[model samples]
Target: FVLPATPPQLVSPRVLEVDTQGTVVCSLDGLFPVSEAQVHLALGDQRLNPTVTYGNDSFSAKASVSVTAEDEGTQRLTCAVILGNQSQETLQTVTIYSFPAPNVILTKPEVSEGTEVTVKCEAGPRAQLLLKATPEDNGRSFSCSATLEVAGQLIHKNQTRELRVLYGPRLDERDCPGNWTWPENSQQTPMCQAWGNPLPELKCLKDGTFPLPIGESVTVTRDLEGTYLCRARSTQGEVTREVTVNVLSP
Candidate 1:
């Protein structure tokens, strides 16, 4: 009697998505018709238990997995074949539908000088969206807003948000101690200054003291009047704080 030649070499299996489960299929290219064969699925970290069947020339395996935000992008599956003790491997790529774009909202929607406040943007599918706060934000209020692009067009504009700005002491050219004096109903020299773009110095007119705490007097030099300003900032952005002072005659 003549002995049958060895089966063709084994190759990796291919996987496909069907309904909610994954289907793995392998080829019988290099194998001699045998009584039995073993197949295995490679899950990232470990190998699954082997399944055995008679010489059917082909095999199929079904597995279930829950889809999540992280899975929305791209994924890969691997398959392998085992004849007696020998095995071969192959890979396939697949993608899951992503969740809908998210909605973004900002509170305290204003802008100003030295405005130190919090601006928060809330959204769903947060993993898929990128959030950003921009300039022109003031008054402890939200500034202008925008969203990611979709189908060649920008996403919903209203989806963006902003917050109000709170600021403190602002210094300017006149903020220098030059020509400085104590205003009436005031106490000491103006110190600790802050300023903004395109604005002159506005000295703190409050007659209290230096390093003035919040809600305290911050007086500026007469020459620096209507110039110096107070500014507050955080990760969100910067803003101006409003200050009203009474300048008494020296």
Candidate 2:
């Protein structure tokens, strides 16, 4: 019976480090080579020269491989040796995992109201996505998907992150109704509400001198018909508006 191609006794590492230039040493120890057998190390498209001695006792080879982000996951390396008339090869199954995942990036750390901001992120070296940020983007979100080919199948992975934008205070026209009408003796309180990131303080005063406590419903009189200054202050910024009330006929 004719003998088939045989596998050389391989001595190599089973793990491949990620994103680092690591050396893989393969030695054919105690194996009888029929000729001046040439040994080679291979990983995917890369082929490397291996050292070989004329002695019939031993042979060796080495290759420095840098596994990048795309090469993250499961892979293999091949060590081949040439005999008198036939070829023999050994396989080294390896797995790669990366630490400190890809980080999320932003163009501006903090932006003023209405200014343009840029958002950039990805799952790996590729698949980059761009977006815009605004004042309302205080909780803006981002994610990127990656499809990995491993174990003869496709594996999809994804990453997610969000942004916190800074902005000033704003008073709603309806909530902080600038105009109020009430009967000469009816009970009501001015509704002046303002919103901000730092929780702005709202203070309403009559002509910036007398305080107008607009919390509880109070009796309205004809003398209350005047312009009241409502100020909202925060770390971001401050704003002032006038609440003009009119005492209608009873």
Candidate 3:
């Protein structure tokens, strides 16, 4: 007497973690006794090796396979079962999620005024978009964004980096009095001022004092009358001015 054979059944999970290996199990039962069984698994075009075990009962069989989740996106896992004189197949799809850190970089981290710079962003393995930046962006935070889509949802991330632009101090010539005459025992003052991105430092060479006071009263003595050089220094550059103080007799 001849008996009919039954198709195999396969089961697997719907979601798998990235870079991890997972297992899928399959079972087969037939009206007639089965001598042997094997299960074949594949992900996309890549084939996977599976272990098949014959059931204790002559008419039943079972198989298990391991698969690795290496890439993100909707991936299909196909399982094909070969029974005595019969073949059956099943398919399962899972969505893989990957989160990569975002990064921002400046082609020229340091630049000078009126200089153009290139800013780049990297979120994953792909090249990111860039934004417009100039020397004015110095000492400021520039940002970039990355986005991805998975399982019908949108994922967004952002990164930022700072830029430094070098600039020179601009002396306010209007504040520097070139030459002045003061009567002996008279109180006189000298002033020097400058403007810069980093706030220039003003100094009086004769006194070696930084940030010389504006309107500082100085006794017009013979010792205090001479050629004084005031300087302004900053990251960009420096500027100096010569002042002659003349002491007059009353």
Pitting candidate 2 against candidate 3, the one with the higher TM-score is 2
Query: For candidate 2, lDDT tens digit of each residue in 9-69?
Result: 5654455546777677666544554245567677765676555544546655656777777
- RMSD per model, one decimal: 15.2, 12.3, 12.4
- TM of each candidate vs. truth: 0.27, 0.50, 0.46
Question: Across residues 42-117, which tens digit of lDDT does each residue of candidate 1 receive?
Answer: 4443354434443444444444344444444346655665555565566655454432434444433554544444
- By descending lDDT, how would the candidates be arranged? 2, 3, 1
Give the lDDT of residue 231 in candidate 3: 82
Superposed on all Cα atoms, model 1 deviates from the true structure by an RMSD in Å of 15.2
TM-score of 3: 0.46
Question: Candidate 3 lDDT (Cα, whole model)?
Answer: 0.64
lDDT of each: 0.42, 0.68, 0.64
